[PDB]
Amino acid sequence: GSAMIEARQVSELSTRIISSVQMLSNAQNEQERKEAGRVLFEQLESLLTHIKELGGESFDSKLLDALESNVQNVINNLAELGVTVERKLWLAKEIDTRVEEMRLLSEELEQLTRTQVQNTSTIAVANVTHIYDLLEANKKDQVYQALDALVEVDLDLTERLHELHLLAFKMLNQIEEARTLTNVDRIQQIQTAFENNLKIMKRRVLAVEDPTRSKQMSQLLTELGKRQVVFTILLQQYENNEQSQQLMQKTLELFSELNSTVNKLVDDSNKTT
């Protein structure tokens, strides 16, 4: 009888809800959340009271239960979806903060290796200038002992650091690309590439003899090594978005399940008038 007036309120509000959950996922800033969802709250309250009225339009034990259960599942689903959204907003905020932290660390390590390539070079010129003196004071035996040092040390070191710097430069780019990363496979790749790249670099510095520096690069490296978890949470990111999508596809199956029941409930409410 009057159950139509109520089930037309349910069927109609269900649609408007499905549209509100989509709006909630596409939220992203804490405003769109405490809004596209706050309107959802209301659209839900209304669904519940109209579902409450439709609830007293029958006494079939079986059907009166499916309804109760269907409604709870819709609420539990929306509720969980909202958690997914608060979590998604938090993860983004987190990743940014931890990444910018490594940018600063990696950037210093890059600038540090560059400082050494820079020093090594001017020192090479100093070393050659000195040969001019020996050479023109006929200190022959020392002239080509300095030449030996020029090759065995300065020239060798020059190439050695170019490599070290090139390696620290690579690491820095992995971190710059790191934030905006969203592709699960690329995140996997950079993740193991970074770890690997870091393991090899930890040795190369421990080798380079230059007390002060080597020590600093090691501290910078272990510190970056720690901040590495940013990749794990970069996955929680991707993962959490796979969830908000599955929940969405679920909302539909539930609202379907519900209306299928609110219909059997309008009928057999028209039996024995």
Binding site: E107, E108, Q111, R114, T115, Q118, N119, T122, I123, V125, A126, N127, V128, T129, H130, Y132, D210, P211, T212
Partner: protein
Amino acid sequence: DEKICAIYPHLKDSYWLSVNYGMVSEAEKQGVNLRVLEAGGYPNKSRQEQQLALCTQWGANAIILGTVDPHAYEHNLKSWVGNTPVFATVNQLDLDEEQSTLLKGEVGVDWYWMGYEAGKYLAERHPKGSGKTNIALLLGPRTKPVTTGFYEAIKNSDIHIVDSFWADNDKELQRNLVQRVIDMGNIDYIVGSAVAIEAAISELRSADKTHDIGLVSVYLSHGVYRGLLRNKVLFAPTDKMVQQGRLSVMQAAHYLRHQPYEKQASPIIKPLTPKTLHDDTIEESLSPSEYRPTFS
């Protein structure tokens, strides 16, 4: 052993590698405990702040500071170092009176005379009425003491500045301009930063224009020195970096040991030409042929 902490803007330059040798060397003769830190480079304003604070946490008796900028710490300093005695080095460190409480010493050279000396050499090689001579300026980033000083010495002298390019003091950027200057070929000299002149030495050789364009450096560096020594560079002044380095340490050492000391030290600039490279003068400028940057 008193603890002295030195903080530089960077340490990639031939210049600061030399200022370093000065401190590490003096610090050892003066019997002090030197510990040096270098900001990433001039743009790392924040890194230097952390380092200034870091020196304090180390418990430094005195701080030798090479500002990453003049007006930074102008209203802070006590906020970073607390109230540790601070001595300025190489660079101008101005800070209000409430802050100046910490300034116990200054060392450095007015870069106006650095550029003035360079220009004076050219002004005398080409007096008024000897023949219009075309110059090209490659002084660096971006006024600026060096420039105005050069301009004053050039004042009245048949020397004409054909053009003046600017760019960061990066070897590759400077090389770019030198190459540009060479192509417009109506230049007789390239006055510029040590780094630019260094580039010009190589670039003038690969283009066979050695003999064609002369090189005048606005300041010293191994490389520029090596150029004078080998007649590839005509002139370059020195502000004795190694000495500026020693002085700052001596100032700090004496102030703490309660001894006399020039509150405002400043070495005497010296002009250098291939034929006048006095040992004593360069020994006070560039670091030794084997010295590697030392931090303690």
